[PDB]
Amino acid sequence: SYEIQGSFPLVELEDLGNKNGLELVNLCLEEFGAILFADNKKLYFYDEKSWYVRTEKQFRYLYNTEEVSVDTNTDNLKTEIKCYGKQKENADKLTGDNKYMAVVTYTSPNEAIYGKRMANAKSDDK
Amino acid sequence: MSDLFLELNGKVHSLSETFPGLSVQEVSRQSPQLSMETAEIAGTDGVIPGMTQFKPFIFSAKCNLQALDIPDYHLAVREIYEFLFQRDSYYIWSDQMPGIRYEVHPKPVDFSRESDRVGLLTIEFDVFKGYAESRGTSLDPMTFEVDLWQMGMNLSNRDDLFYVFRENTFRVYNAGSDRVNPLMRHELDIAMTANGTPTIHNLTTGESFEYRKELQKTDVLLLNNIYPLVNNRRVGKDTNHGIITLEKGWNDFEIKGVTDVTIAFNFPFIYR
């Protein structure tokens, strides 16, 4: 049995089905951004707001912690991206970005701290 | 003469009194175990030391048992083994320095049977906290009632040592051998009752604790260890998560933001 506790957006999907229960549950978690916790055979699906509960317990250095480690990676630090929408019917007859009705370049504000770091273009044809 | 007093499960026993045949010959303590981490840099001389710590040390008491006969010897051995080895730590002290006690766990010992009724032994106790402490807390009347000698002067006779204050600026005397720090799992309680928005400043150590809500005289703010409570409720989200530590000797405290303040410090002294 399943229970839902929270608010989630609508997601458009193609030919849903032909999968086991766990695959569909993982798909739900990845798409709707839910968090799954199971009371034995009863699966509760929360959102970020209703999952975490604030507590007065705290982690203090030299008091109840021994080794603290932070791993930081900046191999994928990108602040600019170019994306293309669907493809026009007269794609062969057209040239350049005119092949797509939707072409947009997004630049994050964090560029002001890191400069322009543009990544490989991603294409969504839907 | 000498004796060893053991406080356990809320009762105080004398080692020479619980077992009539046992007599404590000599009492001694190990030196503080200074542990240090050293890092070596290639191309440079010497080492760089990390933050020092104090490992658990050993309090030793050499004694002898003079039983009436062989069955008495075996019975006394069993009784001593049953009494000494409990599953929880207990406090010990000696008549030579009655004002200072150690919270210890028993160590393995071996009876050296010399004759049919005489056996020498050396009871060792692990002081696992790495320090000694006074027989009571600062607010405990027992602490300043038995004996306490510091730099050749007796603290049990000083009349200027107070730990309950009614003003906004005052001085608190920590008579221990080092700084009291709740982050080091030390015991330190601060109880306050006032009106307004409290703010406590330790100018000697330059520390500060502030509570960002109005307070009333019937509301008691208690800082114990690393947790502040208001009427026995954790309210850490409404504070600055400040920790107040007491340095050696006199610490100058300033209270701001409240009036009609009554503040009490309850903590035991720490001796190396």
UniProtKB/TrEMBL annotation, chain A:
Recorded superkingdom: Bacteria
Coiled coil: none
Protein name: FtbL
Lineage: Bacteria, Bacillati, Bacillota, Bacilli, Bacillales
Full protein: residues contained: 127 to 252 of 378
Automatic annotation (TrEMBL), chain B:
Siphovirus-type tail component RIFT-related domain span: 9-127
Pfam families recorded: Sipho_tail (PF05709)
Source organism, top-level taxon: Bacteria
InterPro entries per UniProt: Siphovirus-type_tail_N
Protein name as catalogued: FtbK
Gene behind this protein: ftbK
